[PDB]
Structure 1
Amino acid sequence: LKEKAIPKDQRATTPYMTKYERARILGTRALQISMNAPVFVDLEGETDPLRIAMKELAEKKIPLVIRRYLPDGSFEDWSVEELIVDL
């Protein structure tokens, strides 16, 4: 009730990025680049925003934080840099 929120310490979630998180982080970032959002990584002549959203994940210059909700309501804010990309 009083904000719940599990801190950045003591977290029971997978340190790896879930395929749904990857697709949401890419889909939204590609949408934002398409909506003229400023690009953080050095562009290599990329005409497609998903080609960029994918390249932004390589250097990890995405400033997004994932609120992963548990079944009891409580959530863990995982920064895209913390989440490892094995998949």
Structure 2
Amino acid sequence: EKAIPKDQRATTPYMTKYERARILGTRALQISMNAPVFVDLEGETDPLRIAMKELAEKKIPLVIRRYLPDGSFEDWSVEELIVDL
């Protein structure tokens, strides 16, 4: 079975430009789909602006499955990933 164990992960401990953009879009779409929000919308209304607060607080409950060319993959949480970008 393909799936690298947490302890054996080797990809950038930092979130990619492409990663952040898909996380930010996915949550934006979900917040707009009437999904539950894990942050205080402090007068906020735009779902991307909301999703941004969620990623800032690292309270986005999604995981990136980084697939390697052999099919095997590493799972990284948005909580795990460093956001220097």
Please tell me the TM-score bracket, short chain as reference. Answer: over 0.9
Moved beyond 4 Å, runs of 4+:
none
CA-CA distance at 1:12 after TM superposition: 1.4
- Once the two structures are superposed, residues 47-82 of structure 1 have per-residue CA deviations (whole angstroms, 9 ceiling, x without a partner) of 100000001011100110110000010000101111
Q: Distance in 2 between matches of 1:20 and 1:38?
A: 24
Aligned residue for 1:45, secondary structure, equals coil
| Structure 2 unpaired stretches of 5+ | none
Please give the root-mean-square deviation of Cα atoms over the aligned residues, in Å.
0.6
- Once the two structures are superposed, residues 22-54 of structure 1 have per-residue CA deviations (whole angstroms, 9 ceiling, x without a partner) of 000000000000000000011111110000000
Aligned residues: 85
| Structure 1 unpaired stretches of 5+ | none
TM-score, normalised to structure 2, is 0.97
Specify the alignment match of 1:16 in structure 2.
14
TM-score, normalised to structure 1, is 0.95
